[PDB]
């Protein structure tokens, strides 16, 4: 059969990567943004748009190419896509040059062993055909201008980029399958070309998978066990080994060490500089210059399949082929990271460094930063000296100052979208490992925002913020953590500059919140502000937070919105709040799944803590009973509460009498919110009962969506005519009628009203009403209106 | 609520009424012949009506001839409404004859949703150079387009033009007419207000408006941009407008995805005392907690600068 012979041929091609593939292969961890490899293309939901558009993301050396070759070999061995698919094809960006227009026939002929495939027979059922695009970072060189060029003929010879762009949007063989493996850097535009794709990220080895990989690498079990033990000797190296490429490099280095008699613990002692130490252990200035210039010209030209002319220009000769390079004549680097490393080393042995600084972005997915990363690696004073004394060369030093200036350029720029993320900057600053320069070039980050998804991220963040000395606002993202939280927040207590800490929407969980709590109550921490919205906490964290409040006198405000604390959680918090050393001022408790029962406890807080100015207990099933319980204790003039809020509390007019008492008595209760409460006109009249009081101080009174009516409208007129202190108001979603609006207008006309804002959003008024509102805006422009819906 | 005889019998006395000043007839389907009857009722010298609203009356181009005669014969009428009547470009061509008359004292003219096109715009231009009493025009919700707006503006750039509060709500414009609007802002010294909602101006259009907004001779006292389908790329231009325009005192940005960075930059720009803005709206978008804190702060230290950030 044709499929059997083609599968045998691709098995022959993909048997090795030399070194055998499957024997050295080890499983990886992948999660859809764990998704099993055998569970790839079936739709989890029965209404999935074509499953044929799946995109893959991963780091450099994560195993996208190895995953592609492994799935191809499985399809060549009778494992996967036998009863489901029939044909699998391989397309590579490096081989498919964008300058030469081609067709799908060319790709099939290249993939087929026979230069004369049955093209007529194999282009009838695209369902059982899957096209693979590996290394997508070499395709969008002209997608930004070729949006409208569409080709749908399989036999038509059109530029490779245009043809693949046509393939992506499912119009050339629309029912065929596609599998694209990409770097995650520059997907922002590609998702526009994608028709309901599935983004799957690759995370690499776990601990057991790492041990399996060392077993499958070394031919000696004892040597593999010693390598494993020395990997756990260095925690940093063990964390770095989640990338299979680093495992390969360290295994080869340990092989070279033990065969030559060198000790293996030296490899473990070497951190963050695996590539440089590996190169030094493996091993002339003309050779280095030629190879470095070859890598640099490949960088500019996006060329990997070098020919003789490049080596002629760079002075490289036939005797200049080594292990890093590979001859196929075709010259190609074994893995790209090596050529970025050589290009980075070039600029320290066009030599103008500014090409790296500003010509970034000309290549999709940012080849340069990785390059520049090793630049920060090499410019390290100890590493620079070691490079000079190991290769007898000299390293330029103005490059460090230029890179510093680039650091401030990146930090202080405005159009921050095009630049790569700040986590890349922190990777660089961890790579270089120069304390004074890190501190000096890092004092330019008053506000730090980072999103963490692996052990390496946690380690680099720990180092970076530990180096920080002048940071004020800090945010974190645990995008998937007791050990993680400990490792990060241990340094935060020692940080004497931090003042605001954002952790909203992170599912750090309850034990992580506990870890944060014992981190905070250390006397060194200077955090005055802590936001914890939607953290997924519960009543357990309230005990720890209460301890923090009773022990810390620097914290000012605090947020706990949308955590199911409950009335028991509030009961736990009030113990800390009532403590005489609590300096809390603003306390959010929105949507904390509360009930009226907690309200009583809250009352004691208002008579035990005087620093609490504004409370926000909206969106809870408090009710009239709870509001009355709060108000009854709140009527004391000594109570210092200012800006209470009861948004969507399900109240009624019953609590309005208590609110009236509060307004009549308290002299500091300025603001007040009541939206989404069925107060009614009786409730508004009851509020008016206290609003007219000469001792009132209410400086705003929101009533949006209170389900009001025009019966208490005279009360509105009275409030405006007599309240000389109220300066804002809201009436959204209240059917008051045209007569009420015009009476409001005529009341506002006089100079005795000091109102400075009013909203009539979202209702249908009249033409006469609109004229009256325009007039009142005309003669008095200070009194703003938002009447327009 | 169900009229030639009816209209005659009623409006015969209205001409003799020496006290009436405003006459509302919105939503009445009095038809076109009834509107004619009203017209011969009005142009009697005794009538003192200064205000006539005719929204959704179901009129057509036929009534425009009679209304033009009324305008050319009456010197007491001040404003006039014709919203949601299918007048058409021919109806506007008929009206402009009366409007261009030297005895027309019209000040406010609504023409919202009059089924117009760009062709009428040229005629309207002559009005602005023939009638100086016309202060505010409202020609929104029509398929005018960039060509029509350019035709209006090209004649509108004269500093002698007395138009103040033009409006182009939902006119289907684009950034092309923004250069003409920039010229208007650069030249005219009385064009205070201006509406542009529901127009796909874009960030390029906002930059083009900023080109004339920054002019020291500007006088624009409000600039609505709600639902203009904006973005954060021209955001520096927003900062520049607030930092340099000392006359603008209102603004609208509803239904514009500007992003958190833009909102916080807006905040920090507004912080300084060099900004005289007295209102701003950020209705109907999803902001951030830090954004909300910044907005609450700017409301705290300076209470005069109102914000409607809450959706
Ligand atoms: C921000 C984000 C998600 O980490 C990212 C964005 O872009 C990339 S990547 O595609 O540049 N890959 C890499 O940097 N891999 C990589 C890493 C380390 C060490 C090495 C490599 C490559 C060889 C040595 C240590 C952590 C990652 C990653
Ligand atoms: N599944 C795997 N099993 C064993 N080694 C792997 C695996 N994936 C990657 N590697 C290691 O990574 C190297 C190849 O990296 P590659 O897959 O080309 O990275 P990328 O896919 O990011 O280009 C090989 O030397 C190999 O040792």
Curated annotation (Swiss-Prot), chain B:
The chain holds residues 682 to 1031 of 1033 of the full protein. Changing residue 83 to D: Mimics phosphorylation state; impaired ability to recruit NEK7, leding to decreased activation of the NLRP3 inflammasome. One of its GO terms (cellular component) is nucleus. The modification Phosphoserine is found at residues 5, 12, 83. A motif (KFERQ-like motif 4) lies at residues 268-272. This is NACHT, LRR and PYD domains-containing protein 3. It comes from Mus musculus (Mouse). The modification Phosphotyrosine is found at residue 138. A lipid is attached at residues 114-115, 121, 235 (S-palmitoyl cysteine). One of its GO terms (biological process) is pattern recognition receptor signaling pathway. The gene is Nlrp3. Belongs to the NLRP family. Changing residue 110 to A: In LRRm1 mutant; abolished ability to form homooligomeric double-ring cages that hide pyrin domains to avoid premature activation. The pyrin domain (also called DAPIN domain or PYD) is involved in PYCARD/ASC-binding. Disruption phenotype: Knockout mice are fertile and appear healthy when housed in a standard specific pathogen-free environment. They do not exhibit any increase in serum IL1B after administration of R837 (an analog to guanosine and TLR7 agonist) and/or LPS. When challenged with LPS, mutant mice are partially resistant to endotoxic shock. Mutant mice display impaired contact hypersensitivity, a T-cell-mediated cellular immune response to repeated epicutaneous exposure to contact allergens, such as trinitrophenylchloride. Changing residue 34 to A/R: Increases interaction with NEK7. LRR repeats lie at residues 19-39, 48-69, 76-96, 105-126, 133-153, 162-183, 190-210, 219-240, 247-268.
